[PDB]
Amino acid sequence: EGQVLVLDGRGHLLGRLAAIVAKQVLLGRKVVVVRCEGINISGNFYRNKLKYLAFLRKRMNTNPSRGPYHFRAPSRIFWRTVRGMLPHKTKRGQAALERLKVLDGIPPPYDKKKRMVVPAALKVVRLKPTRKFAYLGRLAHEVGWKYQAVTATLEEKRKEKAKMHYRKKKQILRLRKQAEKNVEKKICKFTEVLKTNGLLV
Amino acid sequence: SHRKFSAPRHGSLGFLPRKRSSRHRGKVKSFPKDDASKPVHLTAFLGYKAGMTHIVREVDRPGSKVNKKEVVEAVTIVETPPMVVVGIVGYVETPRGLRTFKTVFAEHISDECKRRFYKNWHKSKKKAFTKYCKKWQDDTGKKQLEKDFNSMKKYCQVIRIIAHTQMRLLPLRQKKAHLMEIQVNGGTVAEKLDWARERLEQQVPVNQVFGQDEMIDVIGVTKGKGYKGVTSRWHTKKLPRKTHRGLRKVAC
Amino acid sequence: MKTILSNQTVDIPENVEITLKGRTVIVKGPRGTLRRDFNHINVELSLLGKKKKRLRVDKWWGNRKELATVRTICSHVQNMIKGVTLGFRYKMRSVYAHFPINVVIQENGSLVEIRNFLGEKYIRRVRMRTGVACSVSQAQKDELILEGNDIELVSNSAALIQQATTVKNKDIRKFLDGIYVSEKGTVQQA
Amino acid sequence: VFRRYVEVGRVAYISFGPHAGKLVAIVDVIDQNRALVDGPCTRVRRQAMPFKCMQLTDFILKFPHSARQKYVRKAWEKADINTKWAATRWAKKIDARERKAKMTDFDRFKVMKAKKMRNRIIKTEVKKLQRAAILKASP
Amino acid sequence: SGRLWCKAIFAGYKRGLRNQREHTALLKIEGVYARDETEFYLGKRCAYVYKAKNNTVTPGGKPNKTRVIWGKVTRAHGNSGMVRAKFRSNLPAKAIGHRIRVMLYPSRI
Amino acid sequence: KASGTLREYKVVGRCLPTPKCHTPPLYRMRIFAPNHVVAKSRFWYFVSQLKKMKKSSGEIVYCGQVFEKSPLRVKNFGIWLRYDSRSGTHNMYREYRDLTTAGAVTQCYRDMGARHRARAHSIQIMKVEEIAAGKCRRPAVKQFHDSKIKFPLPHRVLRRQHKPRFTTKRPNTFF
RNA sequence: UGCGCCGCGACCGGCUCCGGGACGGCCGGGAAGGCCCGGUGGGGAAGGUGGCUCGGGGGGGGCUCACCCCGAGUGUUACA
RNA sequence: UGGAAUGCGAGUGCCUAGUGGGCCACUUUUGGGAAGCAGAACUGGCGCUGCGGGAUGAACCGAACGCCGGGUUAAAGCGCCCGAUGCCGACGCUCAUCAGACCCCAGAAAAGGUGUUGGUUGAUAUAGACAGCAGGACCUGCCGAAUCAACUAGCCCUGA
RNA sequence: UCGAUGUCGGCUCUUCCUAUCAUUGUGAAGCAGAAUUUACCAAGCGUUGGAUUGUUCACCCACUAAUAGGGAACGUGAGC
RNA sequence: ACUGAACGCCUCUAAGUCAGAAUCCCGCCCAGGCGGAACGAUACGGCAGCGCCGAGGAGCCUCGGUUGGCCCCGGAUAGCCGGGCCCCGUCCGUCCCGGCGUCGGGACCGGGGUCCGGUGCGGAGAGCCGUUCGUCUUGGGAAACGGGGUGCGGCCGGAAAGGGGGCCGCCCUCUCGCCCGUCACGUUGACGCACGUUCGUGUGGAACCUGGCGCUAAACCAUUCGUAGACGACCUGCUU
């Protein structure tokens, strides 16, 4: 499709999701990635923590304020992995990068929207079940991310409200089943047309 | 090659930018951690450095050579007239940090506090808060104030008071009050707001913030000394007498 | 080599009810209830029989490394069975040459205060795991008793106090001071 | 926890091979990846097929391993696997998915008219049951 | 009453890694993600519709700001549904990542 | 040599007739090669190191493909081979289950490359025979000698990735 | 001989990349495979069916009788 | 009967500039521990030469060049940067708290591992194997089917 | 690199390495205690004042927890 | 070190746990993004500017893109999804005595269970919603507890990053719309042809006229101060 592609980052693998997002954003699509703290990386946590600490050591020793900037929020960590997949020193790469929006948690614009999933980047698909993995949220917290408890309480409040919305949706759905039985005599012809054509069989 | 003899570096990089402070008033960068079980109290105050003198007291540390003996100790006197509460600020916790949610000001604000809102009080018409105050009197405005306190009650995690010093009582040329946010600690957000509301426009003496023989933190701006060489700024070793083109500098 | 099927069975006594919520095992017995998650092991758990129930663990197409988890799960479940029927009781003894080891129990067996270990004035306070009670024995002069249902909780508590009374900067071969686990058994014998 | 099993007699559905959409019977297991299969009543001759291309069904035939085609055929006809398969919900979904893919432009127009009228009647009844539910809950 | 063209995206020019041939453009057509699905679109007319500042004559209409570069789909590209197209004038580079219409006009079905 | 899916070739050759020997003996080998051109080259490789017969002094009397006699019957195959490692040469006996003799040999070349990094040029296959189930020796092959073989397919990886490439539903792998 | 400018179509020819349909030759004059309950046949085993024996687990009627489902042997077509 | 095959049109004179520092690679080879060291043979190359690939690079791999349109390849590639596997690719191996990841080429050895996977040789075990429960002091009884040893070579790990 | 890359040492100052002298946490001993030796994680912190010599190096005197070793164009001359 | 296989014993390791440091990361402290927020005041008085009512339109220039929407469970994956029934806790409103009694029921969730359906997901993103040639004469279905009016108000709607819909009353539009027929036409039947068909009353700018309600300020310089300072900058004072 098109419009804005909203991706739920939970359960995905970092680089495999980044490669797909980088190509979509180069193709002109606007992409939103939410819940970057739920992104997984292959390999045990300690090995992945060592990788980030080696990254932290890289720094211009004459003036580290000029040096490479080590963003600690998981959304900015994901933003930098996509950045390494883009020609970000050209105007085309910059414009594509501006089409990417990354978020920790699910802020107001996007919980009341349906999120998409990329099966080619899901951990349940691409990792063997016996292989160890890390959580970007925990890894970010151990290297200096300040807001993991706060994002956790806001996530919990969101999941409570999403749960009430889903029960109302379920009650509507079961009312619609009862409505179907009630008006079966007066909708039988229209149902017959649908069944013959592959809908409602 | 290596340094012949080791010596620790001169100065600290923990105060690295070593520039003029962007603020004249000292800033509280971390308030004491909130404990809801404790009663409602303030956490900071504003004073003025008057001078230094020395006192005589007898110490009570048993194993010391000065135990039960009279000692002379230098002290500093900080003049602290009472502060006037003029506002309340609410904050919400977000995954991007603490964000200012809503601030409410008192009905009558003194002229010395209004002076902080102007760079040229002489040329001003003194119109600051002249429309805001009318909201405290109008019936529609009163309802909005109550709704605004209720939203702060159910959404804010941090509550602060805007308070200013009274410069009428000080022997200073300056007449413009210093404004400050002072965090309210203890209790619940509802109890903090009720405490704040009732002493809005009121006076808080320093004895209700600090007590005797307690250990406090002092925040301020250091005495200015202008442009300085590396010998005074960083306390480097002076070069020998027979040095060409300068002694008070770092050689390499 | 991937073996097609590796299976093992645990017999459930008559005093114990085992319920399976997927790979979550709930064992209920006269002394209480124990819960344990096995979501980190990809095996299938089944309950067999109406009377004389059994727990069967299956692993399909497993390599050598993951065939070793079949008996590990079975042994753990046999531990929770004995935990809810007999309980776990670990007895410890204080060994000293000159300075007696004084042990005082606080908070109904939850806090252990050890004084005068090797004669020093630092008081060691060891906190037992939840569900583990520490007692001072009346049968022997200087012996502690840890009791509980979870074998891992009881033995971790014993390890906490054994490593608390550790000798530093001296030949550990000669001084030999400390509290050591003497025997592992059950609260009731059957 | 498992119900479907690769076993001799298990009927499987082919997903993506050259024989996609057929039913076969497992005659023998060559190894962990390949099984000897036979489709005597479904126009699939005996051959080796990977397990990756087959989706197991509920039907299990009764014949010994490596049995020849005539015994696989007798079992298939006795159990009437062709008619039992067509009666399942799995096959009904397949046939509905194929006929929707064959819908013409005129059939698309007629489905539009039927769906438009149908949803109006259902929506009216759903609202009536909403009002009944809210009135009964809060009289 | 509705759209009569298929949505395509100008992905880039036909190129190697370090040589770009600008007389051929590469297109990604929505819903076509395999080589075997690109057969329908072969020979189809494609249009790059854009807007400028000055008015230009419109066939069957009044002058407006819409300008078009015409082309046709020449052949498939890769085995992932991408196609290549030849436009009467080489496409501007500012159009990369933007919409190109495939008009269904020369019809074989 | 290289490999595709190998075929079996019966290659019969001999030396050219000479005044010393008017009727030289005929020699036969079974060669597993991608095509008949490689089969003839492989014949000359072995017969030259066995019988002192070079291609220039001989001829290929016959070269045809040996079809599998029971391609619908599951069999066990024993392979006797010798291969060159980085240090030394070794003799190995291996087992495979297959429907065809050629397929079993192709399995062996893949398995030697997988487990020993042995390339095809470093492998000599000297015997391939069909073994009864009772005379098999490797546990990997013996576990399929079970008349009631029965196993599930536990954790099926979704192989149709990128077909939607963006979906609302997360995949289920239980089946 | 050329359109003022912007375009469209048709058939013919050249090069080229593809898609359908149909015909035949050769091999071990292919290897297999299928049907005739093939025959009234002859042998051999096990990844051994039925039967028999031993142990186990779920059924019924009332803890005997018993209906299944397993495991282990023995055994060469019987109820595969 | 133009006395093997194949290919090709040959012969010849005068005048003649620049050059007469070379360098690199497969193989062979001398001195040197060795060297991006010094010195040789043969062929090709760089120098005189751009082009595709090796990220980058005189010499490597491919291929040599008038200005262009279509088609196809070489060497090399096809997650994203970046054209091309978005194949429902095939069989295995391997987890690294310094993993590995492609000629020249840009970093590792001897020696080791009860990590795991293959393979070779020998041996035990119905009279009864190896475990474990103990006794006498190598034998026994109880559990009752595979086990023990040496070696070898793949990936991974120590050596680092 | 010869139509010029200022040259020994010291002084001054920063940063880096670890093949660790001390200090934090440990393992081993021919570890009784004290003292010491061997090894592991480990370079955060510290590693001095002087007589002689232009010296690097060396040597001695004296404190010290220790008085470890090195690099940065054999760091650093429009800094001396 | 714990539990514990591999390897019937053993084992700190394989899965799963524990204690652990001058190291590491954060805090405390210093700075504060071509990074945000809340609040205040927003232009003389007779010449004017400015703000709100999506203000009401009519038009112009400019920058371009795009050419139906999906308003949402949490998640597991060696398992899941949907429906009524039991147990443990919660909630509203009807009588009884604002508050009580399960006084009874309906309507409810959260947890643990139990059954009944579904599971190559069909209560399905291989999906769903909407789906527009326009009017006219008139029939049959459906609806007539409906359509619309930012109509007018009223209630409940919400803070992670103000966007908010549903319900109630009174009017008019009233059964016209939605499905299948019938009847008669078309300012385009423009005589084969491209940029058509939307978002959209788009972003930004300036201006014209008309109607209401509103507003009448600061910043800098200059002058002072010395808590500051090379110069800038900074801290201050100037009818109370």
JSON list of C-alpha atoms (C1' of nucleotides) in Angstrom, two decimals, chain B residues 14-15 17 19-20 22-24 29-30 94-96 99-103 105 115-116 118-120 122 124-132 155 173-176 224-227, chain J residues 27-32 36-42 44 158-162 215-222 224-225 227-240:
[
{"chain": "B", "resi": 14, "resn": "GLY", "atom": "CA", "xyz": [34.70, 18.19, 35.21]},
{"chain": "B", "resi": 15, "resn": "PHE", "atom": "CA", "xyz": [34.29, 21.97, 35.02]},
{"chain": "B", "resi": 17, "resn": "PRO", "atom": "CA", "xyz": [33.71, 24.82, 29.53]},
{"chain": "B", "resi": 19, "resn": "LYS", "atom": "CA", "xyz": [33.17, 30.16, 30.60]},
{"chain": "B", "resi": 20, "resn": "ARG", "atom": "CA", "xyz": [31.11, 32.96, 32.05]},
{"chain": "B", "resi": 22, "resn": "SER", "atom": "CA", "xyz": [24.88, 32.12, 31.40]},
{"chain": "B", "resi": 23, "resn": "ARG", "atom": "CA", "xyz": [22.90, 32.92, 34.57]},
{"chain": "B", "resi": 24, "resn": "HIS", "atom": "CA", "xyz": [23.55, 35.34, 37.41]},
{"chain": "B", "resi": 29, "resn": "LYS", "atom": "CA", "xyz": [19.84, 21.34, 38.81]},
{"chain": "B", "resi": 30, "resn": "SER", "atom": "CA", "xyz": [18.64, 18.46, 40.98]},
{"chain": "B", "resi": 94, "resn": "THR", "atom": "CA", "xyz": [7.44, 11.91, 29.68]},
{"chain": "B", "resi": 95, "resn": "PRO", "atom": "CA", "xyz": [9.85, 9.56, 27.89]},
{"chain": "B", "resi": 96, "resn": "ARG", "atom": "CA", "xyz": [11.51, 12.78, 26.67]},
{"chain": "B", "resi": 99, "resn": "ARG", "atom": "CA", "xyz": [7.69, 18.85, 30.71]},
{"chain": "B", "resi": 100, "resn": "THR", "atom": "CA", "xyz": [6.00, 22.00, 32.01]},
{"chain": "B", "resi": 101, "resn": "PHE", "atom": "CA", "xyz": [2.29, 21.19, 32.16]},
{"chain": "B", "resi": 102, "resn": "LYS", "atom": "CA", "xyz": [0.57, 24.27, 33.60]},
{"chain": "B", "resi": 103, "resn": "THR", "atom": "CA", "xyz": [1.52, 27.23, 35.77]},
{"chain": "B", "resi": 105, "resn": "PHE", "atom": "CA", "xyz": [-0.13, 32.77, 39.29]},
{"chain": "B", "resi": 115, "resn": "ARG", "atom": "CA", "xyz": [10.27, 44.29, 37.81]},
{"chain": "B", "resi": 116, "resn": "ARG", "atom": "CA", "xyz": [11.76, 40.90, 36.90]},
{"chain": "B", "resi": 118, "resn": "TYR", "atom": "CA", "xyz": [11.03, 44.07, 32.33]},
{"chain": "B", "resi": 119, "resn": "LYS", "atom": "CA", "xyz": [14.44, 45.15, 31.06]},
{"chain": "B", "resi": 120, "resn": "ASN", "atom": "CA", "xyz": [13.48, 48.85, 31.36]},
{"chain": "B", "resi": 122, "resn": "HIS", "atom": "CA", "xyz": [11.28, 53.08, 33.89]},
{"chain": "B", "resi": 124, "resn": "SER", "atom": "CA", "xyz": [7.32, 50.39, 30.91]},
{"chain": "B", "resi": 125, "resn": "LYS", "atom": "CA", "xyz": [3.59, 50.90, 31.40]},
{"chain": "B", "resi": 126, "resn": "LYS", "atom": "CA", "xyz": [3.61, 48.14, 34.07]},
{"chain": "B", "resi": 127, "resn": "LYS", "atom": "CA", "xyz": [0.99, 46.09, 32.24]},
{"chain": "B", "resi": 128, "resn": "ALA", "atom": "CA", "xyz": [2.35, 42.68, 33.25]},
{"chain": "B", "resi": 129, "resn": "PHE", "atom": "CA", "xyz": [-0.37, 40.33, 34.57]},
{"chain": "B", "resi": 130, "resn": "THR", "atom": "CA", "xyz": [-3.04, 43.05, 34.37]},
{"chain": "B", "resi": 131, "resn": "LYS", "atom": "CA", "xyz": [-5.33, 40.77, 32.34]},
{"chain": "B", "resi": 132, "resn": "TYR", "atom": "CA", "xyz": [-4.38, 37.56, 34.17]},
{"chain": "B", "resi": 155, "resn": "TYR", "atom": "CA", "xyz": [-1.74, 14.66, 35.65]},
{"chain": "B", "resi": 173, "resn": "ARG", "atom": "CA", "xyz": [20.72, 49.38, 45.13]},
{"chain": "B", "resi": 174, "resn": "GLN", "atom": "CA", "xyz": [18.75, 46.81, 43.14]},
{"chain": "B", "resi": 175, "resn": "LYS", "atom": "CA", "xyz": [14.96, 46.80, 43.52]},
{"chain": "B", "resi": 176, "resn": "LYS", "atom": "CA", "xyz": [14.11, 43.90, 41.18]},
{"chain": "B", "resi": 224, "resn": "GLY", "atom": "CA", "xyz": [34.61, 37.15, 38.39]},
{"chain": "B", "resi": 225, "resn": "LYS", "atom": "CA", "xyz": [38.24, 37.76, 37.49]},
{"chain": "B", "resi": 226, "resn": "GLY", "atom": "CA", "xyz": [38.20, 38.39, 33.73]},
{"chain": "B", "resi": 227, "resn": "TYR", "atom": "CA", "xyz": [40.77, 37.24, 31.20]},
{"chain": "J", "resi": 27, "resn": "G", "atom": "C1'", "xyz": [23.92, 9.47, 39.24]},
{"chain": "J", "resi": 28, "resn": "C", "atom": "C1'", "xyz": [26.06, 14.06, 41.98]},
{"chain": "J", "resi": 29, "resn": "C", "atom": "C1'", "xyz": [28.76, 18.21, 39.28]},
{"chain": "J", "resi": 30, "resn": "C", "atom": "C1'", "xyz": [29.99, 21.56, 34.39]},
{"chain": "J", "resi": 31, "resn": "A", "atom": "C1'", "xyz": [28.06, 23.11, 29.52]},
{"chain": "J", "resi": 32, "resn": "G", "atom": "C1'", "xyz": [23.24, 23.49, 27.11]},
{"chain": "J", "resi": 36, "resn": "G", "atom": "C1'", "xyz": [11.14, 21.32, 22.78]},
{"chain": "J", "resi": 37, "resn": "A", "atom": "C1'", "xyz": [7.59, 23.39, 26.89]},
{"chain": "J", "resi": 38, "resn": "A", "atom": "C1'", "xyz": [4.29, 26.64, 30.43]},
{"chain": "J", "resi": 39, "resn": "C", "atom": "C1'", "xyz": [3.23, 31.52, 31.26]},
{"chain": "J", "resi": 40, "resn": "G", "atom": "C1'", "xyz": [3.04, 37.17, 30.75]},
{"chain": "J", "resi": 41, "resn": "A", "atom": "C1'", "xyz": [2.49, 41.54, 27.69]},
{"chain": "J", "resi": 42, "resn": "U", "atom": "C1'", "xyz": [1.52, 42.45, 22.87]},
{"chain": "J", "resi": 44, "resn": "C", "atom": "C1'", "xyz": [-0.65, 56.90, 18.93]},
{"chain": "J", "resi": 158, "resn": "G", "atom": "C1'", "xyz": [-8.82, 13.67, 26.66]},
{"chain": "J", "resi": 159, "resn": "A", "atom": "C1'", "xyz": [-2.14, 15.22, 28.80]},
{"chain": "J", "resi": 160, "resn": "A", "atom": "C1'", "xyz": [3.49, 10.71, 26.22]},
{"chain": "J", "resi": 161, "resn": "A", "atom": "C1'", "xyz": [3.58, 14.75, 21.29]},
{"chain": "J", "resi": 162, "resn": "G", "atom": "C1'", "xyz": [-5.29, 19.14, 22.40]},
{"chain": "J", "resi": 215, "resn": "C", "atom": "C1'", "xyz": [-6.34, 45.79, 22.35]},
{"chain": "J", "resi": 216, "resn": "U", "atom": "C1'", "xyz": [-3.52, 50.24, 23.10]},
{"chain": "J", "resi": 217, "resn": "A", "atom": "C1'", "xyz": [3.14, 47.24, 24.28]},
{"chain": "J", "resi": 218, "resn": "A", "atom": "C1'", "xyz": [7.83, 46.28, 24.40]},
{"chain": "J", "resi": 219, "resn": "A", "atom": "C1'", "xyz": [13.01, 45.54, 22.66]},
{"chain": "J", "resi": 220, "resn": "C", "atom": "C1'", "xyz": [17.45, 48.07, 21.47]},
{"chain": "J", "resi": 221, "resn": "C", "atom": "C1'", "xyz": [20.45, 52.74, 21.64]},
{"chain": "J", "resi": 222, "resn": "A", "atom": "C1'", "xyz": [21.52, 56.79, 24.77]},
{"chain": "J", "resi": 224, "resn": "U", "atom": "C1'", "xyz": [23.43, 55.07, 35.05]},
{"chain": "J", "resi": 225, "resn": "C", "atom": "C1'", "xyz": [25.46, 50.97, 38.09]},
{"chain": "J", "resi": 227, "resn": "U", "atom": "C1'", "xyz": [28.14, 41.89, 42.18]},
{"chain": "J", "resi": 228, "resn": "A", "atom": "C1'", "xyz": [30.80, 42.40, 35.34]},
{"chain": "J", "resi": 229, "resn": "G", "atom": "C1'", "xyz": [34.47, 43.59, 31.92]},
{"chain": "J", "resi": 230, "resn": "A", "atom": "C1'", "xyz": [40.20, 43.65, 26.59]},
{"chain": "J", "resi": 231, "resn": "C", "atom": "C1'", "xyz": [35.89, 45.50, 23.20]},
{"chain": "J", "resi": 232, "resn": "G", "atom": "C1'", "xyz": [31.13, 43.35, 22.92]},
{"chain": "J", "resi": 233, "resn": "A", "atom": "C1'", "xyz": [28.45, 41.03, 26.45]},
{"chain": "J", "resi": 234, "resn": "C", "atom": "C1'", "xyz": [26.57, 40.70, 31.89]},
{"chain": "J", "resi": 235, "resn": "C", "atom": "C1'", "xyz": [24.43, 42.70, 36.96]},
{"chain": "J", "resi": 236, "resn": "U", "atom": "C1'", "xyz": [21.64, 47.29, 38.19]},
{"chain": "J", "resi": 237, "resn": "G", "atom": "C1'", "xyz": [18.99, 52.50, 38.85]},
{"chain": "J", "resi": 238, "resn": "C", "atom": "C1'", "xyz": [15.95, 56.55, 36.45]},
{"chain": "J", "resi": 239, "resn": "U", "atom": "C1'", "xyz": [8.31, 61.04, 40.11]},
{"chain": "J", "resi": 240, "resn": "U", "atom": "C1'", "xyz": [6.53, 54.98, 44.24]}
]
